[PDB]
């Protein structure tokens, strides 16, 4: 009399929200963009190769200056690179070698990392001594830690394998807000360029939108068949793209509240590990299990090129804030920068 | 190239050499992923060659370092650490991945060995299993197999 009624109410709410989405689904993005000119074939070559890691590279991030990047690896080493000159700036040893994520603070005074130790650890890169020391280790996540992203020098959101997200205050070391609406392990994050919202994909094949200050889920996006491994905001913050294990990318948008485009080819069966956007949002770069990344025309959903210089599963890729280059990491322990 | 850039290059080279030393130190070690039910007699063998997150164990037999990663305690999904553990040489299983070998132990290519009274035989068996998987990675590394 109670559980059945609540289930029926949830089902009818889902039906009505799907009907509302269908009502505004009169047009299609492909139909609108059929008239525009094709982007054409794009050849992008490996301009820099960064060597020094002795294990599979799992994460990388760019600095907001677009010159410095930090990469994590299974050898228990954080390496800050100078992409212009290929030479290393720092090498931060880690207590645990099972790190799965790394973040670069937008100011540049801190870096973060985390993994199977259930801790995103903040490292102070600007000390009076010439060493990098661990500023603080944030604990409280039940499961592993798959992504943490810096909001500012004092705030950071973390996604975790305990189906939750959390917003931390670094000085105190405690969570300020928690985000609990997912069902499966949260595998990815992407902060909006205004630092007001973020999207998180999980193993329940759904992506959710959160307001950082509100602390509650705002929109839920479905459509993928398997777990979502990557997520990325459109440059204007009004849309986002998801990559999953069922070998397809999907572009969702927040205002219309539904999927707009599907990026899949019959020649691709391997899953998707990473996804990013060009500075204008016209290109969508997705990395795959089949050892190479390929470029997608974001408005026409056709391939425009391939990044095929890696010898293993491309696990990470990212584009600079000024859009001059994209850096990809793989399990062959090399980082390549493409222009 | 300026003097400051030259000194930065020198710093990068010193970091490179430190990384080389650490990698040479870690090249003589082997990582083994240990699975179990948590209450299936695994602790007996764990303490047999012994003498939140994942537990690490260290034990040496003949100039070769083994790391044991007991993951039976974690209740999380089985497949969600596989992408993290995709590179381990072998997986040890205690009972009462297209090219990752499995080592099997009986408390009471797949390699099987019934537990003996002395842990020496068990350690020798696991050492032999790691030898074979290292032989075959070396062969692939070469080009033959």
């Amino acid at each position: 009399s109670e559980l059945d009624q609540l289930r029926q109410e949830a089902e009818q709410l889902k039906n009505q929200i799907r009907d509302a989405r269908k009502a505004c689904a009169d047009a299609t993005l492909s139909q609108i963009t059929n008239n525009i000119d094709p982007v054409g074939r794009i050849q992008m070559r490996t301009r820099r190769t960064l060597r020094g890691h002795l294990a599979k590279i799992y994460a990388m991030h760019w600095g907001t200056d677009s010159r410095l990047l930090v990469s994590a690896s299974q050898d228990g080493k954080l390496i800050i690179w100078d992409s212009y000159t290929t030479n290393k700036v720092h090498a931060i040893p880690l207590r645990s070698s099972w790190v799965m994520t790394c973040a670069y603070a937008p100011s540049g005074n801190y870096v973060a990392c985390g993994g199977l130790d259930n801790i995103c650890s903040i490292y102070n890169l600007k000390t009076r001594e010439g060493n990098v020391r661990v500023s603080r280790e944030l604990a409280g996540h039940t499961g592993y830690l798959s992504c943490c992203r810096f909001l500012d020098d004092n705030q950071i959101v973390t996604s975790s394998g305990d189906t939750t997200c959390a917003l931390w205050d670094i000085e105190t070391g405690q969570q300020t807000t928690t985000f609990t609406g997912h069902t499966g392990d949260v595998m990815s994050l992407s902060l909006a360029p205004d630092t007001r919202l973020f999207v998180s994909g999980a193993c329940d094949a759904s992506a959710k939108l959160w307001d950082v200050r509100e602390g509650m889920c705002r929109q839920t996006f479905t459509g993928h068949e398997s777990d979502i491994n990557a997520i990325c905001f459109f440059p204007n913050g009004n849309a986002f793209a998801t990559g999953s294990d069922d070998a397809t990318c999907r572009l969702f948008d927040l205002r219309a509240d539904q999927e707009l485009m599907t990026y899949s080819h019959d020649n691709i069966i391997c899953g998707i590990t990473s996804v990013s956007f060009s500075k204008s949002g016209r290109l969508l770069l997705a990395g795959y299990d089949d050892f190479n990344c390929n470029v997608w025309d974001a408005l026409k959903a056709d391939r425009a090129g391939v990044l095929a210089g890696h010898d293993n599963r491309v696990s990470c890729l990212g584009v600079t804030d000024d859009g001059m280059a994209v850096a990809t990491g793989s399990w062959d322990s090399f980082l390549k920068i493409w222009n | 190239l300026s003097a400051e850039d030259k000194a930065a290059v020198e710093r990068s080279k010193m970091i490179d050499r430190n990384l080389r030393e650490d990698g040479e130190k870690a090249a003589r070690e082997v990582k083994l992923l240990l699975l179990g039910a948590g209450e299936s007699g695994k602790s007996t063998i764990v303490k047999q060659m012994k003498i939140t997150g994942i537990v690490e164990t260290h034990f040496t037999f003949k100039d070769l370092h083994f790391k044991m990663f007991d993951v039976g305690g974690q209740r999380s999904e089985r497949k969600k650490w596989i992408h993290c553990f995709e590179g381990v040489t072998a997986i040890i299983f205690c009972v009462a991945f297209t090219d990752t070998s499995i080592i099997l132990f009986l408390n009471k290519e797949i390699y099987t060995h019934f537990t003996c009274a002395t842990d020496t035989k068990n350690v020798q068996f696991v050492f032999d299993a790691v030898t074979d998987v290292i032989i075959k990675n070396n062969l692939k590394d070469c080009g033959l197999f």
Partner: single-chain antibody
Amino acid sequence: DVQLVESGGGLVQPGGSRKLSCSASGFAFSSFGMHWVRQAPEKGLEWVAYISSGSGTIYYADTVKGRFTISRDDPKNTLFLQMTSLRSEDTAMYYCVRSIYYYGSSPFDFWGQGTTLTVSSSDIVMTQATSSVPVTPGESVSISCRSSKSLLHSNGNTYLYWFLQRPGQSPQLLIYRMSNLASGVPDRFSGSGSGTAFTLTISRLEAEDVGVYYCMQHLEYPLTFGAGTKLEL
């Protein structure tokens, strides 16, 4: 905290030998390249020698090459300057200077207190036209420095450094690479210039802004200083 303490010297007969020691504490001594800088009584700064991190690279001034030997003891965080065949021109106050080099770093941050040595008896030229400028407090003052050649490089950064030596104290960095503000110094210090001519601007003058200001180039070795400019109240 970070501190460099110097020892040795004080009275040396001409033609003799001496050993200056610089004991460091409070920071990772091994990661920093270390400089020796001396200033004669009533004279500006003068870079002496440089030993890099890991002892890989060593430089000497042309006036001390052969007679001086710089070395470090990383286990004990100690810096040495073996000085031999000492001349009457070698009497000065010797400073032990801390510097590290990576992208976005500030070298020449910390200076030791100094030790006095009394001896009984092709490169870039940095020029400061003025020597003594009396300014009342609260008035913006401009300090200029000129270079023999352009300090701008292909990287786009010009290697010009500014130091302030208060009366009775060792110099402290306030501007590195002609634009950046050193850690811990007030925001009223600003640096500008283009290639050859440079200007340091102080907005409001407190009682702690009184001292001698030095302009330094780090484009190539030997490192060169300019004749300091003194501010009076």
